[PDB]
Amino acid sequence: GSSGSSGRSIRLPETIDLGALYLSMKDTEKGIKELNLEKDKKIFNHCFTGNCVIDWLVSNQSVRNRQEGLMIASSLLNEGYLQPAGDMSKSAVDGTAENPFLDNPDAFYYFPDSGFFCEENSGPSSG
């Protein structure tokens, strides 16, 4: 255990700790549910959509509304708690945007701990 906060103002909710939050999402029943979708000829396993993440925070009484979860969800991607999956969010976390999160149902995300494995789905060719 080690504490010692510093600074004039605090953007993030001092009453919360990203680290502790990410743990709640790791839960099977008290965490964010994942799925198996295929994009850009690639089936990402153990991947969840954006919206799901945002809501998951609201339902857990972590935020007041979606927008509110935008910060918590965005920070998770800045620290590493969340990993982008798809040229969609990927282009964001790389682009010049205060928040890498897209709070969109088309944006996928995976945990750095969850057994994430991407499989390239080949296509039917001729000859």
UniProtKB/Swiss-Prot annotation:
One of its GO terms (molecular function) is protein kinase C binding. GO terms for cellular component: cytoplasm; cytosol; extracellular region; membrane; plasma membrane; ruffle membrane. The modification Phosphoserine is found at S9. Residues 28-113 form the DEP domain. One of its GO terms (biological process) is cortical actin cytoskeleton organization. Keywords: Acetylation, Phosphoprotein, Repeat. Major protein kinase C substrate of platelets. This is Pleckstrin. The chain holds residues 116 to 229 of 350 of the full protein.
